[PDB]
Amino acid sequence: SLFELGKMILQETGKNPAKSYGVYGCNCGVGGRGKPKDATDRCCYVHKCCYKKLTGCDPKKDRYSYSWKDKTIVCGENNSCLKELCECDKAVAICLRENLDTYNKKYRYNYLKPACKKADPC
Amino acid sequence: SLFELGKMILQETGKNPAKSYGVYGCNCGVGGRGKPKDATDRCCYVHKCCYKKLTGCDPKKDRYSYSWKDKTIVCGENNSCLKELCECDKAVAICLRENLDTYNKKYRYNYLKPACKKADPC
Ligand SMILES: CCCCCC(=O)O
């Protein structure tokens, strides 16, 4: 669920997830996809495409189990959809951390998104 | 839609809507309802109950027309559902503005929603 996702992002980046990625660029946050503004935005692009492949569980609402082991996100076995969901969230958390070096606050807020260029199909 | 709602909140409060209310308390932004933490939170509680009365349109995606007349949100004549939807959004924007005096930053970027007490029926 959003709770686990946010927790992962905090654990990897050390940043408050809502504050930094709540509405970042054309792909981070509520709404759909759009042409990526930068590398960070592209992380969320991939993430939303990752969600599209899921069946059997709700990516926004459904809780799952994961652990923080030697500062690594380790997805619990859960079930098929929940584990795949967990791996989606782990991937974007890692991706966001790896692209902190080009994070730009000018993409942080907000109004942008409906005017974004339409995204390629996943 | 989300765009009209966000614009209304900005117009009334003068505040960045996603920033101030994206994850505020148990009722503002993402997720469902919960036991409200304060007056601002109650606005969002009422808002989501307002959405339940809606029959035929999508509060998240369906756009509607409104205008800014004498610094007042004025819902334009669309179909019945879109009119009710517009009035739901107008009400919460006004309510959030009215309760800026007790807005508490501690409730802001603080995803506490899974810990919220179960909301009573609308
Ligand atoms: C549009 C972002 C803030 C929404 C707050 C609420 O009406 O739930």
Q: What is the CATH number of the domain that holds B67?
A: 1.20.90.10
Q: Is the CB of residue A11 less than 8 Å away from at least one CB of chain B?
A: no
| Largest interatomic CA distance in chain A | 42
Which of B18, B23, B114 is opposite residue A110, by nearest beta carbon? B18
Distances (CA, A) of A63 to A5, A16, A52, A77, B50: 10, 20, 17, 13, 27
Dihedral over alpha carbons A40, A33, B115, B35 (to 10 degrees): 130
CB-hemisphere CA count at 13 Å for B36?
Answer: 18
Contact between B83 and B74 (Cβ < 8 Å): no
Residue closest via CA to ligand 1's atom 1 equals B6
Q: How do A66-69 and B73-75 pair as beta strands?
A: unpaired
Question: Chain A within 8 Å of B33 (Cβ-Cβ)?
Answer: no
**Which residues touch B86 (CB under 8 Å, ≥6 apart)?**
B4, B64, B66, B75, B76, B78
DSSP state of B33: -
Count of domains observed in chain A: 1
Resolution (angstroms) stands at: 1.7
d(CA B80, CA B85): 9
Q: Which of B2, B19, B113 is closest, CB to CB, to A30?
A: B2
CB neighbourhood size of B21 (10 A): 26
> What's the one-letter identity of residue A8?
M
Distance CA A73, CA B60 (A): 32
What one-character-per-residue DSSP string does B41-70 give? HHHHHHHHHHHHT--SS-TTT----EEE-S
Backbone angles phi, psi at B68, to 5 degrees: -110, 100
Say if residues B49 and B122 touch (Cβ distance below 8 Å): yes
Bridge partners of A85, per DSSP, are none
CA torsion, ordered B46, B4, A33, A79, to nearest 10 deg = 10
Solved using? X-ray
**DSSP reduced 3-state for B73:** strand
Phi and psi, residue A60, nearest 5°: -85, -40
CA distance A35 to A42: 8
In which domain, by residue range, is B43 found? 1-122
Encoded tokens for A67: 């652990």
Strand stretches in chain B, DSSP E: 66-68, 73-75
Kindly write down the DSSP assignment for every residue of A56-77, as one continuous string: SS-TTT----EEEETTEEEE--
Mark the breaks in chain B: residue after which each occurs, C to N over 2.5 Å: none
